[PDB]
Design a protein around this motif. Structure first.
Motif, mmCIF file in Angstrom:
data_model
loop_
_atom_site.group_PDB
_atom_site.id
_atom_site.type_symbol
_atom_site.label_atom_id
_atom_site.label_comp_id
_atom_site.label_asym_id
_atom_site.label_seq_id
_atom_site.Cartn_x
_atom_site.Cartn_y
_atom_site.Cartn_z
ATOM 1 N N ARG A 1 0.784 -1.246 0.000
ATOM 2 C CA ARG A 1 0.000 0.000 0.000
ATOM 3 C C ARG A 1 0.813 1.294 0.000
ATOM 4 N NH1 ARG A 1 -2.519 -3.767 -1.463
ATOM 5 N NH2 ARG A 1 -4.552 -4.444 -0.672
ATOM 6 N N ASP A 2 2.176 1.200 -0.025
ATOM 7 C CA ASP A 2 3.080 2.349 -0.140
ATOM 8 C C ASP A 2 2.798 2.949 -1.490
ATOM 9 O OD1 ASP A 2 4.539 2.188 2.228
ATOM 10 O OD2 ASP A 2 6.423 1.621 1.288
ATOM 11 N N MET A 3 2.748 4.300 -1.563
ATOM 12 C CA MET A 3 2.488 4.990 -2.813
ATOM 13 C C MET A 3 3.733 5.559 -3.490
ATOM 14 S SD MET A 3 1.267 8.473 -3.971
ATOM 15 C CE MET A 3 2.602 9.582 -3.830
ATOM 16 N N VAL A 4 3.709 5.562 -4.830
ATOM 17 C CA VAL A 4 4.768 6.061 -5.684
ATOM 18 C C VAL A 4 4.114 6.980 -6.717
ATOM 19 C CG1 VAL A 4 6.577 5.435 -7.353
ATOM 20 C CG2 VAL A 4 6.289 4.070 -5.279
ATOM 21 N N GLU A 5 4.655 8.200 -6.834
ATOM 22 C CA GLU A 5 4.196 9.176 -7.822
ATOM 23 C C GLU A 5 5.310 9.400 -8.785
ATOM 24 O OE1 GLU A 5 2.669 13.069 -6.537
ATOM 25 O OE2 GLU A 5 2.480 13.483 -8.695
ATOM 26 N N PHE A 6 4.978 9.275 -10.064
ATOM 27 C CA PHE A 6 5.866 9.434 -11.210
ATOM 28 C C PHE A 6 5.560 10.730 -11.981
ATOM 29 C CE2 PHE A 6 5.883 4.661 -10.858
ATOM 30 C CZ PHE A 6 7.243 4.427 -10.889
ATOM 31 N N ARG A 7 6.603 11.316 -12.565
ATOM 32 C CA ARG A 7 6.457 12.482 -13.419
ATOM 33 C C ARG A 7 7.243 12.238 -14.688
ATOM 34 N NH1 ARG A 7 4.848 18.436 -11.771
ATOM 35 N NH2 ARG A 7 4.045 17.216 -10.004
ATOM 36 N N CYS A 8 6.578 12.389 -15.857
ATOM 37 C CA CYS A 8 7.279 12.218 -17.135
ATOM 38 C C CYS A 8 8.307 13.329 -17.332
ATOM 39 C CB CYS A 8 6.315 12.138 -18.315
ATOM 40 S SG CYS A 8 5.338 10.613 -18.383
ATOM 41 N N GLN A 9 9.428 13.012 -17.986
ATOM 42 C CA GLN A 9 10.444 14.031 -18.267
ATOM 43 C C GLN A 9 9.946 14.988 -19.350
ATOM 44 O OE1 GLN A 9 14.111 11.642 -18.680
ATOM 45 N NE2 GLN A 9 14.642 12.481 -16.648
ATOM 46 N N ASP A 10 10.551 16.184 -19.444
ATOM 47 C CA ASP A 10 10.128 17.211 -20.401
ATOM 48 C C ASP A 10 10.025 16.682 -21.835
ATOM 49 O OD1 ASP A 10 9.875 19.044 -18.291
ATOM 50 O OD2 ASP A 10 11.542 20.331 -18.926
ATOM 51 N N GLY A 11 8.876 16.923 -22.464
ATOM 52 C CA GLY A 11 8.629 16.468 -23.827
ATOM 53 C C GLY A 11 8.061 15.063 -23.946
ATOM 54 N N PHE A 12 7.745 14.436 -22.794
ATOM 55 C CA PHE A 12 7.124 13.118 -22.755
ATOM 56 C C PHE A 12 5.683 13.232 -22.332
ATOM 57 C CE2 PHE A 12 11.570 12.075 -22.883
ATOM 58 C CZ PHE A 12 11.604 10.967 -23.702
ATOM 59 N N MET A 13 4.831 12.357 -22.865
ATOM 60 C CA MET A 13 3.383 12.275 -22.587
ATOM 61 C C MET A 13 3.138 11.047 -21.685
ATOM 62 S SD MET A 13 0.367 12.883 -25.526
ATOM 63 C CE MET A 13 1.061 14.380 -26.119
ATOM 64 N N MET A 14 2.231 11.158 -20.713
ATOM 65 C CA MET A 14 1.930 10.045 -19.814
ATOM 66 C C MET A 14 0.754 9.185 -20.287
ATOM 67 S SD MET A 14 1.614 9.989 -15.584
ATOM 68 C CE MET A 14 3.276 10.064 -15.286
ATOM 69 N N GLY B 1 -1.441 6.158 -18.381
ATOM 70 C CA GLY B 1 -1.676 5.580 -17.063
ATOM 71 C C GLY B 1 -1.734 6.602 -15.944
ATOM 72 N N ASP B 2 -2.189 6.172 -14.782
ATOM 73 C CA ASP B 2 -2.289 6.972 -13.569
ATOM 74 C C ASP B 2 -0.872 7.260 -13.065
ATOM 75 O OD1 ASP B 2 -3.382 8.090 -11.112
ATOM 76 O OD2 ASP B 2 -4.928 6.487 -11.078
ATOM 77 N N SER B 3 -0.630 8.459 -12.496
ATOM 78 C CA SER B 3 0.678 8.852 -11.946
ATOM 79 C C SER B 3 0.950 8.292 -10.544
ATOM 80 C CB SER B 3 0.850 10.370 -11.947
ATOM 81 O OG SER B 3 -0.252 11.046 -11.364
ATOM 82 N N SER B 4 -0.108 7.903 -9.799
ATOM 83 C CA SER B 4 -0.013 7.383 -8.420
ATOM 84 C C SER B 4 -0.410 5.933 -8.408
ATOM 85 C CB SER B 4 -0.871 8.195 -7.449
ATOM 86 O OG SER B 4 -0.348 9.512 -7.335
ATOM 87 N N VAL B 5 0.487 5.087 -7.882
ATOM 88 C CA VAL B 5 0.355 3.634 -7.861
ATOM 89 C C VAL B 5 0.651 3.090 -6.470
ATOM 90 C CG1 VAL B 5 0.772 3.449 -10.389
ATOM 91 C CG2 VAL B 5 2.730 3.288 -8.816
ATOM 92 N N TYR B 6 0.012 1.971 -6.102
ATOM 93 C CA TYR B 6 0.228 1.408 -4.756
ATOM 94 C C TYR B 6 0.697 -0.033 -4.801
ATOM 95 C CZ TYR B 6 -2.688 5.553 -3.982
ATOM 96 O OH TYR B 6 -3.260 6.811 -3.995
ATOM 97 N N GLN C 1 -1.482 -0.258 -12.484
ATOM 98 C CA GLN C 1 -0.204 -0.735 -13.007
ATOM 99 C C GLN C 1 0.746 0.445 -13.248
ATOM 100 O OE1 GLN C 1 -1.696 -4.758 -15.389
ATOM 101 N NE2 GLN C 1 0.455 -4.180 -15.194
ATOM 102 N N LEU C 2 2.064 0.180 -13.328
ATOM 103 C CA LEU C 2 3.037 1.257 -13.557
ATOM 104 C C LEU C 2 2.709 2.044 -14.823
ATOM 105 C CD1 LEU C 2 6.259 -0.730 -12.765
ATOM 106 C CD2 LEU C 2 5.222 0.982 -11.294
ATOM 107 N N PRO C 3 2.755 3.401 -14.789
ATOM 108 C CA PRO C 3 2.440 4.169 -16.009
ATOM 109 C C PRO C 3 3.555 4.116 -17.074
ATOM 110 C CG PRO C 3 3.110 5.651 -14.266
ATOM 111 C CD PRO C 3 3.129 4.294 -13.668
ATOM 112 N N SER C 4 3.367 4.800 -18.221
ATOM 113 C CA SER C 4 4.449 4.894 -19.217
ATOM 114 C C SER C 4 4.622 6.323 -19.755
ATOM 115 C CB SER C 4 4.318 3.861 -20.335
ATOM 116 O OG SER C 4 3.162 4.090 -21.123
#
Length: 254
Positions: A218-231, A233-238, A248-251
């Motif tokens: 249940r630990d949360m992880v928030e991801f941010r795409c690098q400049d010029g990348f489109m996401m 999936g959801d940015s917050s995953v548990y 699931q992990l975003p891309s």
């Protein structure tokens, strides 16, 4: 009108004598030298005051038939006669021990290869790596050569029940990059506790949340795409069971 006969690298006169003038029509008795197939012949002084020996009079002696080493090849660049050379190579997964080349030389009253053919032996490997909370399966636990495969498995508890999740590629094989030293194809897997998740990786993204060496359920992880990348999936995953993430992990796509 003939000068003294030529000084042949392949022949010598049977009965040499002091002289330097021979009329046309004179025949002299010559012999093939060491390394050439024994033959007695005649050189004649022709009408144009030049000496002529018979064509292909001295044939270079043959050395023994080379063989390909087991797991290797013999390379005949010219022939297997006096003065020629052979080279050897080992096949993929084998390394050469001995001489990689030989030359056909005079040996006593005959000819022989100045080196013995080499051995092409299987490339050896170190015992595969030890991993905490697991081990590898092998019929021979301390003898590995090129091509051999080892599968890892996590330790069970004292009742034989599943205690860890095996993370990564469970199997590795003995290979070689240089054709001399044996290396394992990749790193061994990890044996992670059932309430844990290993750090997640998303290409072209950074974690903006608290990084951890190991995450708990249940630990949360928030991801941010690098400049010029489109996401996607959801940015917050548990952290879920079986080292999974919900969602699931975003891309991150360019």
């Amino acid at each position: 009108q003939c000068p003294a006969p030529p000084l042949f690298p392949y022949a010598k006169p049977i009965n040499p004598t002091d002289e330097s003038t021979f009329p046309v029509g004179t025949s002299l008795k010559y012999e093939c030298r060491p390394g050439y197939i024994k033959r007695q012949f005649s050189i004649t002084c022709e009408v144009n005051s030049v000496w002529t020996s018979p064509q292909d009079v001295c044939i270079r002696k043959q050395c023994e038939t080379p063989l390909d080493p087991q797991n290797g090849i013999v390379h005949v660049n010219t022939d297997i006669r006096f003065g020629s050379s052979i080279t050897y190579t080992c096949n993929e997964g084998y390394r050469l021990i001995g001489s990689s080349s030989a030359m056909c030389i005079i040996s006593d009253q005959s000819v022989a290869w100045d080196a013995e053919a080499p051995i092409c032996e299987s490339i050896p490997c170190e015992i595969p790596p030890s991993i905490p909370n697991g081990d590898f399966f092998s019929p021979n636990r301390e003898d590995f050569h090129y091509g051999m495969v080892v599968t890892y498995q996590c330790n069970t508890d004292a009742r034989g029940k599943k205690l860890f999740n095996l993370v990564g590629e469970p199997s590795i094989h003995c290979t070689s990059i240089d054709g001399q030293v044996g290396v394992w194809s990749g790193p061994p897997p990890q044996c992670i506790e059932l309430n844990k998740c290993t750090p997640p990786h998303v290409e072209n993204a950074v974690i903006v949340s608290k990084n951890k060496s190991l995450f708990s359920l249940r630990d949360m992880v928030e991801f941010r795409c690098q400049d010029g990348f489109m996401m996607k999936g959801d940015s917050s995953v548990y952290c879920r069971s079986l080292n999974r993430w919900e969602p699931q992990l975003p891309s991150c796509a360019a």
